Design an enzyme around this catalytic site. Structure first.
Site, short mmCIF file in Angstrom:
data_model
loop_
_atom_site.label_atom_id
_atom_site.label_comp_id
_atom_site.label_asym_id
_atom_site.label_seq_id
_atom_site.Cartn_x
_atom_site.Cartn_y
_atom_site.Cartn_z
N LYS E 11 -19.67 17.20 4.78
CA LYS E 11 -20.57 17.75 3.78
C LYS E 11 -19.90 18.93 3.07
O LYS E 11 -18.99 19.57 3.61
CB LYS E 11 -21.88 18.17 4.45
CG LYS E 11 -22.58 17.01 5.13
CD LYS E 11 -23.96 17.39 5.65
CE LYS E 11 -24.70 16.16 6.16
NZ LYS E 11 -26.05 16.49 6.68
N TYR E 51 -29.99 7.96 2.91
CA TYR E 51 -31.13 8.40 3.70
C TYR E 51 -32.42 7.75 3.22
O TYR E 51 -33.45 8.41 3.05
CB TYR E 51 -31.25 9.92 3.66
CG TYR E 51 -30.06 10.62 4.27
CD1 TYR E 51 -29.46 10.13 5.42
CD2 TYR E 51 -29.53 11.77 3.69
CE1 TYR E 51 -28.38 10.77 5.99
CE2 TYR E 51 -28.44 12.41 4.25
CZ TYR E 51 -27.87 11.91 5.40
OH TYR E 51 -26.78 12.54 5.96
N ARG E 87 -19.68 10.39 17.85
CA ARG E 87 -20.96 11.03 18.13
C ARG E 87 -20.81 12.13 19.17
O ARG E 87 -21.30 13.24 18.98
CB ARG E 87 -21.97 9.98 18.59
CG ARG E 87 -22.12 8.80 17.64
CD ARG E 87 -22.65 9.23 16.28
NE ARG E 87 -23.99 9.79 16.37
CZ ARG E 87 -24.72 10.16 15.32
NH1 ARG E 87 -24.26 10.04 14.09
NH2 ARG E 87 -25.93 10.66 15.52
N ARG E 104 -19.81 19.56 15.85
CA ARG E 104 -21.12 20.15 15.59
C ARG E 104 -21.42 21.32 16.53
O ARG E 104 -22.19 22.21 16.15
CB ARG E 104 -22.22 19.09 15.71
CG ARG E 104 -22.35 18.20 14.49
CD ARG E 104 -23.81 18.04 14.09
NE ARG E 104 -24.54 17.13 14.97
CZ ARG E 104 -24.91 15.90 14.63
NH1 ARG E 104 -24.65 15.41 13.43
NH2 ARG E 104 -25.56 15.16 15.52
N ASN E 114 -25.54 21.53 7.67
CA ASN E 114 -24.49 21.08 8.57
C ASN E 114 -23.29 20.63 7.75
O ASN E 114 -23.29 20.69 6.51
CB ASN E 114 -25.00 19.97 9.49
CG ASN E 114 -25.12 18.64 8.78
OD1 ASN E 114 -26.11 18.38 8.09
ND2 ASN E 114 -24.12 17.79 8.95
N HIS E 117 -21.71 14.33 8.90
CA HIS E 117 -22.68 13.28 9.17
C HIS E 117 -21.93 12.01 9.55
O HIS E 117 -20.81 11.78 9.09
CB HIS E 117 -23.59 13.02 7.96
CG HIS E 117 -24.79 12.19 8.28
ND1 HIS E 117 -25.93 12.72 8.83
CD2 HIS E 117 -25.03 10.87 8.12
CE1 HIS E 117 -26.83 11.76 9.00
NE2 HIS E 117 -26.30 10.63 8.58
N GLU E 128 -23.00 1.80 6.16
CA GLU E 128 -22.28 3.01 5.77
C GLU E 128 -20.84 2.71 5.36
O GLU E 128 -20.23 3.53 4.66
CB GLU E 128 -22.28 4.02 6.92
CG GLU E 128 -23.65 4.58 7.24
CD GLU E 128 -23.61 5.55 8.40
OE1 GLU E 128 -22.57 6.20 8.60
OE2 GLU E 128 -24.63 5.65 9.13
#
Lengths: 141, 141, 141, 141, 141, 141
Positions: E11, E51, E87, E104, E114, E117, E128
């Protein structure tokens, strides 16, 4: 008293990419004392004695040649409570069950080809020191 | 609102080897704001006020002189939710019960000689800011 | 004999991005001894005394306010032959005439807004230590 | 053809602080091949044979014991044009005449106590390989 | 079989400070294979499709324009068991519930802004991968 | 005025070992602005147009296929005085004539297989931007 020695060897999988660095860096960051560092192409007898309790495994035959194919580097370290400290430094065997920020949890891909092996117990280290690291080849201080 | 200040000081055990680096690096990489950084050889009264609730301990007498022997560095940081964020950054007191990838979980050896002390709670920080860091010595922005 | 002190301060241009790290790292990796570390928002008189020989410059008026706008961090270091050692650590003033692998040769963009200032000579350091770092605020060992 | 071997040993001065790391990191960053890594407490005869041409020096007597006091680590590396490549990696002997971004130009303090010694020429390496690194103790690939 | 692809995009919050490094470093540290790397200023239709299941949220309106303001960088990686590996590489959404040594758990401050993603599931990655990374723009090897 | 763009591409030799990291790290350390990052398997026409002035070379035929064999990554950067700044960041072509602390002076082994190519002059960059990086694929800010 304070002579806790731990035998740790880097499997050839990492040495193919090198990456021997940052290991001694983490060790000195914790503040451990190096006692010995010797590397040799271990023969089949040494490998089978290393995993004498694991010989009755189908994967044993594959690994005993896969790790033998490339050169290997062995190392011993001296420190207080280093036992299980090295273990928590590395991480649990399965890469999936291995949190990041560690050795096994940040480099290894599959259980078949890992990079680091170590001593589970003090008694295990008592023989992992011998028959590979010949005596009077270390430093006591 | 957003004026959460945390007092964190590096004990002389690390400053003997230096190693003051990477701490501010982690703080800025997380994205915290420095508000003050002053270091002095704290007198015995300051040390005993720091651990007034820990005076009735046999180890208190040893530590109050062991950490006094060398010079110490103190620091304060400003950030949102920095409380308990510094704590999780450091790790639990016992080196054995401290996962790697942290401060206390990657540098300390024994509970007797640790390197970093911090504020357990906001109320604790409200006095850990004072009586050592004199007022109008910080930056508000 | 071995009391060579050098005054080095990080200009606010870098502290805007922080990046205070790796500086003490290089200093300790070379093997220098920290003697003091204090930071304050220096007043105009301190800045003009810092560059009393540079007052008769059109760029002096701009810089004396540009560096004053943000907070600044000052530092002093003790080491053998640290004089001109800090200089070669930083690099020549012009970013173009500054090889990589240094401080000034790896971070600065323009001569107008640099990040680090230091003592050109021992005699310069003899006054750069004073009038900003108050005495009996350092450590001798 | 492509069997250029270079003998490089880390003096005990660095091993006192450890700092053995980042050396193999730079070597693999350049892309050199490790051929051997053995460390022993070298006896006085080995040290005097190492500096047989430097025996007629007042500083020789001091160094031959100063470096003998602590344990030492020796290493050999294989790579194309590694000769003088290791030299430019380290830097010139005098710390003052040694630019940063190197080994000798970033870690050493004084000529009396340096950390790294190496082979000036290929002919020098032809004997620096022997009499310390016993044969059939390396890897050819 | 071994064509597990994962879509991960940084991001703009991090790209404001850059910090694009140390991300691919961890991927190669683990030993993953890069398959594609393209960055574009994603339009609103791309953002809302990303989203679509999160449109009925009060924070959805804020986020869809917040990250749109700055440029964004997207990336896809190929590796065995890469799903659920990234993840755990990043960490749980809430910065408080995120241990250090991760992405994260070491960089983010608040849930609102954040930096990274990713794909929760393989089926999520299966969409995706498309509609943002146009086909025949990757490498298969 | 301040729209100095420089085209820099990493040859597949490094991407074989990855090592794409630390490049953006050095760029942000200097403080440059990323304007574009696209990677594609460039066709033979693109390669020959890249080295149209170098076609009449025996080594041209070898390189035009050696670099084509693997995937390549291209990048463009925006910064003040970035011209020749990238050049001094990399280093002179010959690995021997390349000081450490740089890109070409710390990674490359032989002139035949280097890792990074760049724009020698602004005029060269004026065409190195085009015919590979399609327009309206960058960010202006």
């Amino acid at each position: 008293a304070n002579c806790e020695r731990t035998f740790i060897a880097i499997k050839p999988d990492g040495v193919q990419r090198g990456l021997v660095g940052e290991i001694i860096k983490r060790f000195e960051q914790k503040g451990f004392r190096l006692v010995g560092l010797k590397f040799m192409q271990a023969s089949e007898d040494l490998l089978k004695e290393h995993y004498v309790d694991l010989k009755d495994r189908p994967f044993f035959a594959g690994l005993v040649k896969y790790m033998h194919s490339g050169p290997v580097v062995a190392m011993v370290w001296e420190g207080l409570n280093v036992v299980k400290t090295g273990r928590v430094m590395l991480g649990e065997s399965n890469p999936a069950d291995s949190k990041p920020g560690t050795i096994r949890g940040d480099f290894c891909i599959q259980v078949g080809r890992n990079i680091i092996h170590g001593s589970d117990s003090v008694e295990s280290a008592e023989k992992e020191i011998g028959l590979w690291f010949h005596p009077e080849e270390l430093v006591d201080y």
